Amino acid sequence: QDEMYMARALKLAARGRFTTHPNPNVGCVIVKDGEIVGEGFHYRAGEPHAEVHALRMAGDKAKGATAYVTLEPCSHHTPPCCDALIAAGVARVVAAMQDPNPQVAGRGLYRLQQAGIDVSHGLMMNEAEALNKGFLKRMRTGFPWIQLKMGASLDGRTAMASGESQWITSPQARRDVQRLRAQSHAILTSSATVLADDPALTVRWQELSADTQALYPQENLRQPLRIVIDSQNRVTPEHRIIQQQGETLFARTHADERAWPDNVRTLLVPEHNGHLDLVLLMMQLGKQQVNSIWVEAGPTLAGALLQAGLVDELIVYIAPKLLGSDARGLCALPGLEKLSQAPHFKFNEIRQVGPDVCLHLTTA
Amino acid sequence: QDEMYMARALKLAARGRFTTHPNPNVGCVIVKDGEIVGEGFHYRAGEPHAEVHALRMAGDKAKGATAYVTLEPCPCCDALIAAGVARVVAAMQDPNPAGRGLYRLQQAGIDVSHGLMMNEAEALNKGFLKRMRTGFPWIQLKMGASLDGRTAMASGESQWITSPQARRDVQRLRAQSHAILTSSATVLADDPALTVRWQELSADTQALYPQENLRQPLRIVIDSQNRVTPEHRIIQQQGETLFARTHADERAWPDNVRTLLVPEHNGHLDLVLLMMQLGKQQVNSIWVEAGPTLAGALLQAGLVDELIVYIAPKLLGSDARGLCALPGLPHFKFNEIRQVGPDVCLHLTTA
Ligand SMILES: Nc1nc2c(ncn2[C@@H]2O[C@H](COP(=O)(O)OP(=O)(O)O)[C@@H](O)[C@H]2O)c(=O)[nH]1
Numbered sequence: 001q002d003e004m005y006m007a008r009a010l011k012l013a014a015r016g017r018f019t020t021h022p023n024p025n026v027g028c029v030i031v032k033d034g035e036i037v038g039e040g041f042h043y044r045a046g047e048p049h050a051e052v053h054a055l056r057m058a059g060d061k062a063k064g065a066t067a068y069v070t071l072e073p074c075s076h077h078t079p080p081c082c083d084a085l086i087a088a089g090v091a092r093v094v095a096a097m098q099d100p101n102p103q104v105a106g107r108g109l110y111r112l113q114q115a116g117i118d119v120s121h122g123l124m125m126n127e128a129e130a131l132n133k134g135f136l137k138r139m140r141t142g143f144p145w146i147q148l149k150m151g152a153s154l155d156g157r158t159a160m161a162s163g164e165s166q167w168i169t170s171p172q173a174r175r176d177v178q179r180l181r182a183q184s185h186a187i188l189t190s191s192a193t194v195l196a197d198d199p200a201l202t203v204r205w206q207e208l209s210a211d212t213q214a215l216y217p218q219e220n221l222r223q224p225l226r227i228v229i230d231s232q233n234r235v236t237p238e239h240r241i242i243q244q245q246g247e248t249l250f251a252r253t254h255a256d257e258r259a260w261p262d263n264v265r266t267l268l269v270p271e272h273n274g275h276l277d278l279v280l281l282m283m284q285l286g287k288q289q290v291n292s293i294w295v296e297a298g299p300t301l302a303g304a305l306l307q308a309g310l311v312d313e314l315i316v317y318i319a320p321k322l323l324g325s326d327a328r329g330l331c332a333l334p335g336l337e338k339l340s341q342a343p344h345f346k347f348n349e350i351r352q353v354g355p356d357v358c359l360h361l362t363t364a
Numbered sequence: 365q366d367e368m369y370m371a372r373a374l375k376l377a378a379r380g381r382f383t384t385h386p387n388p389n390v391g392c393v394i395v396k397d398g399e400i401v402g403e404g405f406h407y408r409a410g411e412p413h414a415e416v417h418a419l420r421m422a423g424d425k426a427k428g429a430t431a432y433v434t435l436e437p438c439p440c441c442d443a444l445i446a447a448g449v450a451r452v453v454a455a456m457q458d459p460n461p462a463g464r465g466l467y468r469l470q471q472a473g474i475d476v477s478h479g480l481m482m483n484e485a486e487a488l489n490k491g492f493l494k495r496m497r498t499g500f501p502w503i504q505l506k507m508g509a510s511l512d513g514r515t516a517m518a519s520g521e522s523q524w525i526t527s528p529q530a531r532r533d534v535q536r537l538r539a540q541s542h543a544i545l546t547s548s549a550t551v552l553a554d555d556p557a558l559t560v561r562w563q564e565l566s567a568d569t570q571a572l573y574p575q576e577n578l579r580q581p582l583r584i585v586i587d588s589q590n591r592v593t594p595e596h597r598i599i600q601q602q603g604e605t606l607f608a609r610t611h612a613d614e615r616a617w618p619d620n621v622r623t624l625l626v627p628e629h630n631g632h633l634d635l636v637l638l639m640m641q642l643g644k645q646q647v648n649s650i651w652v653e654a655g656p657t658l659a660g661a662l663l664q665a666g667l668v669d670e671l672i673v674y675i676a677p678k679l680l681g682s683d684a685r686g687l688c689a690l691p692g693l694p695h696f697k698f699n700e701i702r703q704v705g706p707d708v709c710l711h712l713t714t715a
Pocket residue numbers: 190191192193229230231232233274275276278300301303304305334
């Protein structure tokens with residue numbers, strides 16, 4: 001019945017997923033007497049909301065029209081979306097889900113019911129929830145959504161005994177990582193990897209599939225915040241990661257006394273044993289409005305995040321190669337000497353990416 | 365049009381994939397005036413062929429009918445002519461030295477054709493076609509590991525990384541393999557039985573396999589230094605056991621135990637020659653359950669045709685035992701990936 005318009009609405013909402021952070025993905029569909037007369041989605045932060053975009057396009061035809069929104073309309077003064085709907089005289093509003101704030105939820109929808117509008121909530125809620133896993137987790141929990149990525153060979157190895165980790169996964173796999181990088185609020189790495197590989201960890205618009213490039217105009221490329229974990233300030237100001245377009249954040253235990261570019265700032269995290277308290281680092285990040293973190297780490301940091309229980313999702317790319325028994329493993333799990341204490345997961349989705357396969361796992 | 369019948373005979377042909385060895389899988393459908401009056405598939409080696417099974421079904425109605433066979437008829441060719449049939453359709457030619465069977469019909473007034481769903485027919489006897497073409501069996505390497513390619517821990521536990529669902533899947537893949545190969549190293553560590561357990565076959569597969577009809581795959585143990593003893597489980601089981609020895613053991617073994625003498629090469633057993641001799645013994649397909657040392661050795665020899673990988677959603681750590689030991693340093697391609705319980709199974713062919 002209504003499912004076509006909402007589905008269209010969430011498809012519209014996904015158009016903003018590369019540039020919407022720290023705001024979520026929202027799409028608006030306005031139908032009057034069975035004909036769409038308004039469409040919009042949120043694109044950047046501080047820019048016009050989705051419902052406003054669609055009301056501005058619908059104009060006079062919004063009177064007595066139904067509005068499909070992927071979330072509860074903004075209910076607080078930019079002037080709030082919930083009142084703009086009233087100003088335009090929409091007679092019916094369908095929202096896929098409510099606000100994630102524990103108290104603010106339902107406020108907007110009530111205000112329309114108080115002003116005589118038809119309101120309902122929950123239609124395609126699960127699809128709406130999946131569009132904003134990071135934001136919703138940060139709005140409910142203090143913590144962001146964490147994506148641990150791993151790219152290995154069939155036998156679980158990430159680099160040969162020579163250290164040649166240079167491109168064991170497929171070029172299609174690298175394009176797939178670029179897409180998932182591009183919609184990530186932030187990218188996280190350890191100093192162990194920075195010293196070993198001296199990486200860029202920047203979203204390279206060139207190596208993006210053209211389907212995405214048709215939705216991501218290059219001039220609006222948002223470079224995700226780069227977070228480097230350096231509890232002992234081993235990274236130097238001459239490493240590639242810091243002299244890159246976009247901003248770099250260093251999780252340090254004490255301030256480094258050298259001079260750094262303006263696009264580099266330092267976050268001080270308290271210490272646990274000999275290093276940062278990783279959970280606390282995730283906490284402060286949540287307090288700074290970071291929705292989702294894409295983790296590009298070697299075996300050490302991957303083992304840490306798992307052993308701390310900070311991983312919400314495992315993304316594993318497997319290449320159809322056998323890389324030998326003496327090649328570097330996937331993650332370092334100290335004290336794991338019996339397999340009953342091994343970490344346990346659940347396969348959500350398995351998909352083909354060129355000659356590779358990509359495995360999506362959840363903790364439980 | 366006639367593809368609908370070839371597909372029927374292919375489905376029939378698969379019905380004996382469990383008991384057919386060393387013979388291939390073949391199905392036959394005879395249609396006359398739009399009705400399949402004859403059906404059959406080969407079931408057991410030494411039992412009647414499929415074309416005969418189908419001709420016995422069609423009887424007098426076989427006259428002036430059309431035969432769809434998944435492989436060129438063998439002889440099965442004469443009973444075809446003796447039954448008065450025109451227009452034989454064959455999925456593929458025989459990989460034996462070949463088209464003689466088609467000639468016996470081409471020049472005897474019968475119409476012929478070749479190639480209909482040829483790829484699907486070739487997929488149903490991967491071992492038999494390879495052996496008839498190269499003299500070598502089709503080699504399936506099974507691997508079951510955690511998410512980080514780990515089998516067992518540094519202690520050597522390995523105790524149920526894979527699901528019970530994945531074990532039952534293995535038994536299904538074991539039960540259609542001609543033979544099952546392992547190394548002495550695995551025999552000494554686990555004292556395994558390496559038997560197809562009808563009790564461990566999922567009810568989907570048990571529908572096909574009747575319990576009283578169970579054909580145990582030939583068991584092959586590579587024991588190049590004769591370290592397995594006749595007290596081990598594997599020799600005290602139903603069916604034959606073949607030992608790939610380098611020099612003949614002098615002990616007394618059960619009647620079902622026999623040895624195969626393989627030339628050495630640079631002090632170790634020559635795996636390539638072993639396969640070559642095993643083809644002479646008519647072994648179509650080999651299911652390989654092996655630890656890191658044997659598995660890498662087959663791969664490095666280039667003898668692995670197919671990888672079967674079960675992955676469990678666990679991590680064992682980077683110091684736990686790996687999958688294949690590759691001294692000196694293999695490329696594949698994913699054919700089928702599928703879910704088996706909480707694990708996934710990946711099917712890879714040499715690429
Ligand atoms: N300073 C720093 N910290 C790291 C690096 N790699 C990982 N980490 C973090 O610091 C710890 C590294 O592991 P380790 O010092 O042996 O402690 P463990 O993880 O508790 O065994 C983990 O908690 C990681 O989260 C690195 O290169 N530099």
